[PDB]
Amino acid sequence: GRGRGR
Amino acid sequence: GRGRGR
Amino acid sequence: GRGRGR
Amino acid sequence: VSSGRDLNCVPEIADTLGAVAKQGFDFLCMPVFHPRFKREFIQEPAKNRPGPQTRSDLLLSGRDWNTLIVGKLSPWIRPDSKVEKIRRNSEAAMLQELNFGAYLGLPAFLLPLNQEDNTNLARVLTNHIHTGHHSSMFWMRVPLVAPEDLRDDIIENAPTSGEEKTWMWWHNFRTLCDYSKRIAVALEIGADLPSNHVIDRWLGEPIKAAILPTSIFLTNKKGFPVLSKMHQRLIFRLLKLEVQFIITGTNHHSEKEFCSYLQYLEYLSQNRNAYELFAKGYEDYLQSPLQPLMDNLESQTYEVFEKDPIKYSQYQQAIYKCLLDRVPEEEKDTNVQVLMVLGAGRGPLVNASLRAAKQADRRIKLYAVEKNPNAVVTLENWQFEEWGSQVTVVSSDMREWVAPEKADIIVSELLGSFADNELSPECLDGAQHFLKDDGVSIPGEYTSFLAPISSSKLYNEVRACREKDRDPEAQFEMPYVVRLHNFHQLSAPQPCFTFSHPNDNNRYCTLEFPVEVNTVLHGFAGYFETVLYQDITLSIRPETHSPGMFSWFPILFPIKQPITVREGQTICVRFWRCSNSKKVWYEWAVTAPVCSAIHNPTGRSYTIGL
Amino acid sequence: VSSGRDLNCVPEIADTLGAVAKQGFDFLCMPVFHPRFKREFIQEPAKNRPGPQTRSDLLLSGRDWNTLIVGKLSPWIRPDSKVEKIRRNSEAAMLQELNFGAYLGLPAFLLPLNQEDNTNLARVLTNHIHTGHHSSMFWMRVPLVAPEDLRDDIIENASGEEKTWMWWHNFRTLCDYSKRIAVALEIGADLPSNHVIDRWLGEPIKAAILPTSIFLTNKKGFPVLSKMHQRLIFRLLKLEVQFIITGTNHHSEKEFCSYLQYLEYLSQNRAYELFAKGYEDYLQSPLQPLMDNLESQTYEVFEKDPIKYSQYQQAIYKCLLDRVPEEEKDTNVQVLMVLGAGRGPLVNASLRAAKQADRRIKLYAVEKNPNAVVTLENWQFEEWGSQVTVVSSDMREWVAPEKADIIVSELLGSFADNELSPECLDGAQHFLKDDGVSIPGEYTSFLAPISSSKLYNEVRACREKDRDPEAQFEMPYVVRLHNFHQLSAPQPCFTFSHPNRDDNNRYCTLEFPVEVNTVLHGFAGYFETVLYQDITLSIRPETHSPGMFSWFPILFPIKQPITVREGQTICVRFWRCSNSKKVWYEWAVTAPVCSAIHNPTGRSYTIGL
Amino acid sequence: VSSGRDLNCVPEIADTLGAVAKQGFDFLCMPVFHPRFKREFIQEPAKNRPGPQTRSDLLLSGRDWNTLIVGKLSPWIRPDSKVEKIRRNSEAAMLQELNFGAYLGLPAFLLPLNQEDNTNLARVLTNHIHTGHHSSMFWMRVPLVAPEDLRDDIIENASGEEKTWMWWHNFRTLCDYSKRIAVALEIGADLPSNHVIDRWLGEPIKAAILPTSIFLTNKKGFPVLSKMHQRLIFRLLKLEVQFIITGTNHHSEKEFCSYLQYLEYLSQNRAYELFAKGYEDYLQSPLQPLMDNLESQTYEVFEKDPIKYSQYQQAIYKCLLDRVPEEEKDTNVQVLMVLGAGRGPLVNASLRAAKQADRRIKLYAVEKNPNAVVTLENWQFEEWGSQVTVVSSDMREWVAPEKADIIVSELLGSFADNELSPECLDGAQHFLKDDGVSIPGEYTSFLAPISSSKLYNEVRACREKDRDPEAQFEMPYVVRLHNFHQLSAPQPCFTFSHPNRDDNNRYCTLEFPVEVNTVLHGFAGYFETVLYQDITLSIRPETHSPGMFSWFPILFPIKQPITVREGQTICVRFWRCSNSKKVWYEWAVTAPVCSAIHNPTGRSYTIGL
Amino acid sequence: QFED
């Protein structure tokens, strides 16, 4: 999970 | 619908 | 069913 | 009453059907092949037998086949024989006869359950049902008493689970066939009836026909067919289920015609309340519980609420008693009792409050709070045209409304079929800060009740409630408002949850139900009782049911897999009333005699929206 | 004819329903709120306006509201206004009126499409549809001609006909082709061309709106309509729409019953249609008589057709006259094999044909259905006797005792080969004499591109659990297509001739010149068959055998609709594919825009060998 | 560089694979059957040709077949021939070769797209893909320039650049955008324009085919490439394609290792990219910190961005300087409220800012996460002391003991308001002083139309059971889109400013002028935010904050792709919708063709309040 | 009446 995502 | 049912 | 259809 | 004639001899089909319909029967149970015409399917020369196998389908019209004829399997067909040759021939002939019945478009087909092992019969039927398209129902012909238990004691060296035998046969058969909608019971009633709890388990089963031999009939002083009082009581119970009665056997009262066996059943049908008239068309028909808090009800939904006069009579009597109690007769003309009707509806509970204050000769200043913006239209037209300044109509939610004063009585009508499944606790919690410290809430308290039930038809209805684009087994994790009719109740109801107003609404209940029968558990039926004021109560519990009060059907909580229970085995179930800030739901799990999963975890299949 | 009155002024509502029912109307389109009662939802003091907002529920019964009243949206509600305050007030008021109509349980609600941009209206409607449970239809009130095109030429210093259809198309596309959104068409004085009316007639039109101003007067002073208007009324009467009459009485000497009386006059002034009644736009799965056994009630509707079996008897009669001269009339016996004899009708047709041809035949009735073998053998015992030999075998497995002079079969489906007539007749061809005849000896299938929003919605409504979610678009449907628009003339797809003395796999490319603008929704499949030389059976809509109803057309849907302009040819490709065990069809549109191959490997529809 | 050798002549297979590996190639594209060994499947005697049809399986090991060999279809196989016998033989031979490659377990298989009509090839491929179980990839060999446009002008008596892309588009549309069908692009001598290369870069290009004929010769003799060709190689090396070298050695003085060595040389001469590596075109779901409690690892991913927290510290520094003059430095205490304090990087930023600004602050750290409150309170006990007051409450329902001079929050998402910053800061502005400041001061979201066929296949692959079968197209996806094509410049959608002193529902209409023929696949959403006056954080692809990888772009898909041509304008409507419980987005494309409204009533995606 |  990276960039404000799960 | 009757008896408190939809 | 009519016209050769079920 | 709709009744049919079982004949194993049809020399001519048109003549026989005419003579059968002449004497009053509505259908004819007949063999589609000759019952003695045993066919061979494997071994020569008899495999290659010429000629037509049976009589033609052109002897009756297509609608005659589709409406008037119930086909019978041939008696020599024994698909569970221990001889392999007989077993194979009987599988092939069963398939041939079933396929010919499907070709004829027969509405029903009679097959016999006259022995314990019917697994191959079940397999050939299950394979027929899953092959092609056909609409025929399959009436498994099962006796009330096993044939080996009806024989006379006349064998000198062989003298004569005893009562629960043929139900075990039927249960095994329909369990193998995966509880098909198309497989039902044709029950044979013999001369000697079983006990009353055996008759209750049978009455909770998909019985579409009852088979009455002419040999179980007694004879009058005038010489007419009659039945015993225990048989008549069985007939009266079966007439509730709207079964069809099949007369078998020959005319054992030969002096009068065969019409008399039918005329007695017509007599008993013509010799068997408002709730039963209201509930017709709704038996065993699942509908969703109403959620008035997060769904705005239609006007036709409110119309059936206002159609019950007993509930509003009781509310008016409770307000009457409370008004007399809170105002002495000396302070009658100068004390104004601020009433607040919360969720005022389209009017009827406000009208009950006004009528109560008139017959109590007391002065009330009423507030009618209602969040439904479309029922506020009705309420405000009521206020303009009739109520005037006495009633202040508020278009707000009781939980967020800011009252201009505190109430003496708050009156609500927020009770569901299970007494709290419409968030009456949560709504009346937010409506206590504008209640006076000696203020009264109506209803004062309410309890929910649960009882374990058994119903194959209800279980199949819940399975048929499967929807696409959702969990394939979520239908078993929702309660259903149902006029549950074809069911068997396994134990008495016990109280589940109690709420009292004015007052955590999360609850945990454990209920242990002693069982005195040998059944299969399919769900729990939930009822409620409410105390509005001192001795004024509304109850849908079937022992203390308020008479003619049809505002509420029972609720049904299913279980995903049926739980087979035996005698002396208590059923322990546990209910949780769970909630968060957003939602409220119920969870349940059977823990004895066999555990099941918790149904509806986190409200994944059913929540009540706050 | 069933008709309603559109009123914008209802002073008292029970009196108005009385005065409307006396003059013959069946429903009443009325505003649920006052049309001039603008509400404010955001700003004080007008947001807090007291009193009731509209009329009470109790003025009419529940049955009255659910059957007699069609609600209207207020004219000031403008959800696509360029002013944000007007836009938000109009969203809120549209929601309020729609929710009040859902609460009243009205059967329908009438909303106007009177400009090009209706996107916010579409969103508010499609959010109402997905909120709560309710069952109102939404009749979107759209004109045949835009209101700025039928204005007078009066101003001194100030897509022509395909305009309001594009309004409706955009609206129904934003709402994702809802089953609950339909058309209420306004017919003005200026009718458009004939191909505009055909797109309109392929749409979900539940109502037609006739102003009293489009009525012209006769010598006696009554309202009548022009001949072009009358023709439009007849085409709409074929669809069984309801007629809404709006406006004031422009013929004041008469009463308002006269417009309705003229409509009933045109209603009375308006066998295949009788048989097809009740089956219009009702999708069915095509029969598979080789892989499934048919009910006797399925054979009954086959034998209900006199024309097909009269044509078969005529073909056999002419073939028997050809194969046997008058000199060899008695000493020559012709072997006929009725393959798939059914319950009798081709065997009876062959017997009558040889009787009227005065020729001798030895007939074999081959049938694999054991339940139909029962009735064939009862026929043989009771009527036919030794002339007919009944065989309970597949024609592809049967070992014949002798070769045949004519083989006669009825194995044709609605698309002429979707019931495996090629494979069955190729299996049965080896017991045919080298100068033998097959009846039918020839059959061709025909495809035409069609548009129908209703048919597309029925195909979507065929979506089933435990299945691929778009398998329903990869199945042919035997459908009496009724509410559709056909985009181009039919064109032959596949041809099979018997006997084949040479692969039944076929690949066809068909280019359809679309002389109009449309939205392609599927393909309709018909067939022609030559039984014997000039005896034919056809369901093709230009060569249709009159009175013959044993075959409805086939519909091959496509997964997504394809918008087609004028001058754009539609290029489609069809494959008849097969293996050892099954036969299927695959189709793909390749021009103007490609689509996926539908039904690859027969994953959604096969015909079982 | 992973690279391969394309040979059409393999005399011995083991020797050739050895020599190819000696030159340095990773795989080898080779014909599984002999390219000239045309086979007959229908006509005798050549149908019954004896002997083995091709080489043995046993000539290479299993792992050699699955990792080293890319198969090729024979050049004589024309399934779309106009001669029926040729095309049936070619269907059968293509099936045979594809089945042999599936049997050999080859990783890939090259098929040629060298003509406009490739529908029968598409059908045979689609039927192979749906028959049996096999996992080989299909690389469709398509040129940048059609071969009839590369031919010399030497014939005496005898759509330009967008031809072969439309070949590929028609092919992949017929085959239904399969995951197993990709592109092998041939780069010829003549190279198309920049926008043709952009649609191509948006495609599933798994390999690039470089003939040795396109290589230029330098003064030392080795193969080189033109500057436009070098640019194309760099753009393809961004995609990590494999380069296939075809043809013969035109630089015969040098080896065939030289063509490979030049590509290795270009490879060795080509923070956000290192972070985003391994996440390209990987669809996450956007975080919902308000409705879901995060994890330690999520917060840790947040706090590995020094640029964002340096920006917040600079904004607080400038605001503290502005609100307190130098003379009032030691007596004025500024109440800062960090709303959603996390594990505490914003609190540390505020403390470091107040040190750097040299001003005195009383700080509140509000956090509703009960598990991050543990970290905050251990911070408070150890480091912060009495300066910071940790509140374990929602900022909306928390009752403050004083008003705030500044409120600071990090509640922004990839679309700037999908994590409910407006609704959280709306309920958190009643404890802000009338001259109070909110950091971020305002934030805007920006949308651009994009084409990405791989992203469309990823969204299709997100089809989850037990839900709407097309509800994956109605969710935004946090995605590091890599293999895409941006059709137009971003334009601002929604703007929120805090404090709001005057509805968070919004409606935007954006018209995007496209200058190129494309196929719209979705909308990519970015955001900008002004924290304080000149201090901004941006994820827009032009104004992107350098090395700031806190936020990936957001992606709103559309259910069916919308083909667009040059000069058209894509008009799309975006709505921010809410109720008391939930917030969601709805979108719909209205021009050039309408789409359905996506996510009505939040049926597929809501953000929980 | 009904005449055109």
Ligand SMILES: Nc1ncnc2c1ncn2[C@@H]1O[C@H](CO)[C@@H](O)[C@H]1O
């Ligand atoms: N919180 C609430 N405030 C006001 N009326 C309510 C509330 N919840 C339910 N109701 C109303 O109570 C009635 C339930 O029978 C309905 O009229 C429903 O609209």
Ligand SMILES: Nc1ncnc2c1ncn2[C@@H]1O[C@H](CO)[C@@H](O)[C@H]1O
């Ligand atoms: N292969 C076959 N052999 C015999 N009868 C067939 C065959 N296929 C179809 N039929 C019969 O043909 C009739 C018309 O399709 C039906 O009675 C059907 O059962």
Ligand SMILES: Nc1ncnc2c1ncn2[C@@H]1O[C@H](CO)[C@@H](O)[C@H]1O
């Ligand atoms: N209403 C709220 N009150 C407090 N913290 C919040 C709130 N909403 C989100 N957050 C926090 O904000 C941070 C980033 O969204 C996370 O630590 C999250 O838990």
